[PDB]
Amino acid sequence: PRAKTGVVRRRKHKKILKLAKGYWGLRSKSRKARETLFAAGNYAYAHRKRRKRDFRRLWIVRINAACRQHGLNYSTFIHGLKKAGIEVDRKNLADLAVREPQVFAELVERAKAAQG
Amino acid sequence: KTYVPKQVEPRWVLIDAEGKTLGRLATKIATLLRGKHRPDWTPNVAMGDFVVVVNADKIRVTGKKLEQKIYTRYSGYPGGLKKIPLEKMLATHPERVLEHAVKGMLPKGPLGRRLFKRLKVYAGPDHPHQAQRPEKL
Amino acid sequence: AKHPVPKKKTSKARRDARRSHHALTPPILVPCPECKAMKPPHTVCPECGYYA
Amino acid sequence: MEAKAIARYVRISPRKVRLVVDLIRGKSLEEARNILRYTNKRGAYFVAKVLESAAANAVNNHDMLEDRLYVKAAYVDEGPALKRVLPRARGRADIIKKRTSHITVILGEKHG
Amino acid sequence: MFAIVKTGGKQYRVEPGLKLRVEKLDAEPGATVELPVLLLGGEKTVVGTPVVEGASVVAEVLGHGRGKKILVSKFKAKVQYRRKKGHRQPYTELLIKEIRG
RNA sequence: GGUGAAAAGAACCCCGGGAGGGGAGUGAAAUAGAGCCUGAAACCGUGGGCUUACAAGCAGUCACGGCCCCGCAAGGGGUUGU
RNA sequence: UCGGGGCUUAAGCCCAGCGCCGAAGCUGCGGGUCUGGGGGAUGACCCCAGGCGGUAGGGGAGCGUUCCCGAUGCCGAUGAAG
Ligand SMILES: [Mg+2]
Ligand SMILES: [Mg+2]
Ligand SMILES: [Mg+2]
Ligand SMILES: [Mg+2]
Ligand SMILES: [Mg+2]
Ligand SMILES: [Mg+2]
Ligand SMILES: [Mg+2]
Ligand SMILES: [Mg+2]
Ligand SMILES: [Mg+2]
Ligand SMILES: [Mg+2]
Ligand SMILES: [Mg+2]
Ligand SMILES: [Mg+2]
Ligand SMILES: [Mg+2]
Ligand SMILES: [Mg+2]
Ligand SMILES: [Mg+2]
Ligand SMILES: [Mg+2]
Ligand SMILES: [Mg+2]
Ligand SMILES: [Mg+2]
Ligand SMILES: [Mg+2]
Ligand SMILES: [Mg+2]
Ligand SMILES: [Mg+2]
Ligand SMILES: [Mg+2]
Ligand SMILES: [Mg+2]
Ligand SMILES: [Mg+2]
Ligand SMILES: [Mg+2]
Ligand SMILES: [Mg+2]
Ligand SMILES: [Mg+2]
Ligand SMILES: [Mg+2]
Known part of the structure; x- marks a missing residue:
C-alpha cells in the first residue's frame, strides 16, 4: 500500500497562505510566507507583553501632565496617594484627569494634604 | 478604553529669550512643542502648542561656549567638514542656535x-503678530 | 553569462515601475480641407489627394 | 449590453500588444479606428482586426448602433508560447519563447 | 454617576446601566453580584482609605462566555523550535444595575 | 493516457486572407468545443475598494485614528496615516 | 559627536536623604497541563499546593495520508472524491 502525498501538502500550504494574507509582495505567496509568519508570531507575543508598559507609560505622562497644573510631580502626587492610602488611582483610571477633573483636583489636595 | x-x-x-541659558530654554520649548x-x-498625533520665540540673539550660554563650541555641518563632498563656532552663528543668522x-x-x-514646524523663531521681537501670543516664561 | 550579473531578481514592483515611462501617445491627427478625413498634419494621405 | 470579440493564439507578444490595446481603452469606436490606423506598431494590425469584428457583431448580432459604440473594455492575455532552440556560441544552446496572445475587445452603446 | 469598581484584578469606571465584561466570576448564569469593591463617585465619593466604606454597586451576571482565540506562538531560530498554541480567554458579562454607593 | 450517455463534432448567417471569434444549433452540462473531465500553485492581465511623490526599509507587529464594506446596534472585514 | 541635543552654585564630582520611574522578576484576577495531598468506600468530577526557558537527546499522548476487516453493509444525482 503506497500512500502518495495527494491533498495533504497542498492543504497545509493553503492554511498558511491564508494567515500570510495581506503581507507585502511575495510574503503573501509561498514560504517566504511562513518565514514571515514565524516572526509575526514572536512579534505579537512580544508586543502583547509590551502593550502593558505601553499604556502604563501613556497614562503617566497624562497624569504627570495633569497634576503639574496643580503644581507638582507625578513623583509626589503618586507619593501622597500611597500615604493617602488610596489604591484608587490605578494609573489607568487617572484618566479622570481628562474627564471629570474635579475628582482629580480633589484627589490632588487629598495627597497634597496626605503629604504634610 | x-x-x-x-x-x-x-x-x-x-517667549523672550534674553537671559535664558540656551539649552535650559530649548528643553521647555521642546516640551511645549509636543502636546x-x-x-x-497623544503620541501619534501632534497637538503641540505653537511656540513663538523672540530676542533669540540674546541667548545666554554658560562657560566658554561662544568661542569653544563648534557646529559641524557635513556637506556631501571630499573635505566637506564645515565647522562653525558658536559666535559666528549668532553674529550671522542667530535664530539658528536656538x-x-x-x-x-x-x-x-x-x-x-511636523513639530519642528510649529516652533517659530526670530531675534527681535516683532514676530508676525496675528492673534494668540500668550507670553510665557 | 559572465562578469557582471544581476544580484537579485528585480521585483514585480521595481519592474513595473521602470516601465512607467513606456506607454505610447496616440498619433496626431487633423481633419483635411478636402475630405472629413483624418491626417497626420503636414502629410498628404490617400483617398483625398492634394492641390498645388 | 456588451459586444465581445476575441482573437486568440495570435503570434505577437503580449507585452507588445498590450501597448496598442492601451491606446484605445475606453475610446469612441470611431476614435479608435483612427488611432489604431495611424499607430506605428505591428500591434495595431491585430487589435484593429479584432476591434473591427467586435463592432460587426455589435451590429449584425445585437442591433447595437455603430455610430454610438465605444471600447468599454479590452485586454490581452498570454497564450502558450512556442519554445525554440537557438544554438549559441561555444556549444551552449538557448531556448526562445516566441510568445502568443489572446486579444479581446468589447464594445458598448454610449448612453441615452 | 461615576464610580470606580475593582473587579477581577483590574478596576473600571462604571455607569448607571452599561454592559462591561470582566475577569470570570463564580456567579449564576444570570444572578446578581454586588461589586462590594467600589472607589469614588459622581460627586466625590472619595475613597479616603483603599475601599469606600458604606458603599457598593449592583450588577447582573449577563452570562459568561469566552473570547476570540489568540495564537500565542513562539519560534527560536538556528534551533528547530516552533510552538503554536490556541488560547481563548474566558470573560463573564455584566449589566450594571445599581450605582447606589 | 481521459469530450460526451451518444458525434449528436457545431448546418447557416455575420467580421477576417486565414486563424479566431459573434450569433444560430446539439447536449443534462459547451468556462464538456475537440491534446476538450476535474483544472490547484507559481506566473501574466482587466475592473473595483483602501493607500502612496519630505521619505529610511527582514517589510512585520502593538496602538489610535481616517476611509470602504457586512450587520438594526454592540460587532466585524478590508486598507494604512502616525 | 559625550548615544545625540544640550549641560557650569550643573544635567559634572564627592557626602547625606526622601521620593517616583523602571523586566516576561514578585503581586493581583482568570485559564491551561502535569505531579503530589484530599473529598470521595468508589469510578466520577471538585477543591488546595506546587512544577511547566531549552540544542544534542531520553520519555508520553495524539493528529492526518494510503490500504484491509467492519461491507451481500452504510452515504451518494435532492450531487461522491477532489
Ligand atoms: Mg511524499
Ligand atoms: Mg497592510
Ligand atoms: Mg504589478
Ligand atoms: Mg553566436
Ligand atoms: Mg558547435
Ligand atoms: Mg534572530
Ligand atoms: Mg464532422
Ligand atoms: Mg461558430
Ligand atoms: Mg441559410
Ligand atoms: Mg494571399
Ligand atoms: Mg480549424
Ligand atoms: Mg454538470
Ligand atoms: Mg467550470
Ligand atoms: Mg483550435
Ligand atoms: Mg488546444
Ligand atoms: Mg484557473
Ligand atoms: Mg468596495
Ligand atoms: Mg506627504
Ligand atoms: Mg471595502
Ligand atoms: Mg510573575
Ligand atoms: Mg495564577
Ligand atoms: Mg476539567
Ligand atoms: Mg499552577
Ligand atoms: Mg519557569
Ligand atoms: Mg519544557
Ligand atoms: Mg527546567
Ligand atoms: Mg491507490
Ligand atoms: Mg451543489
Missing part, C-alpha cells in the same frame, strides 16, 4: 519634524 482626543485648535505662545503639558497627551537645539530635543520621525 483610554480617552482619545478629537481635533482641536492649536494654542500659541510667546505634553496637556493632560490628554532652532539648531530644539530640532535636537524633538524626536526623530515625520512627527518630530
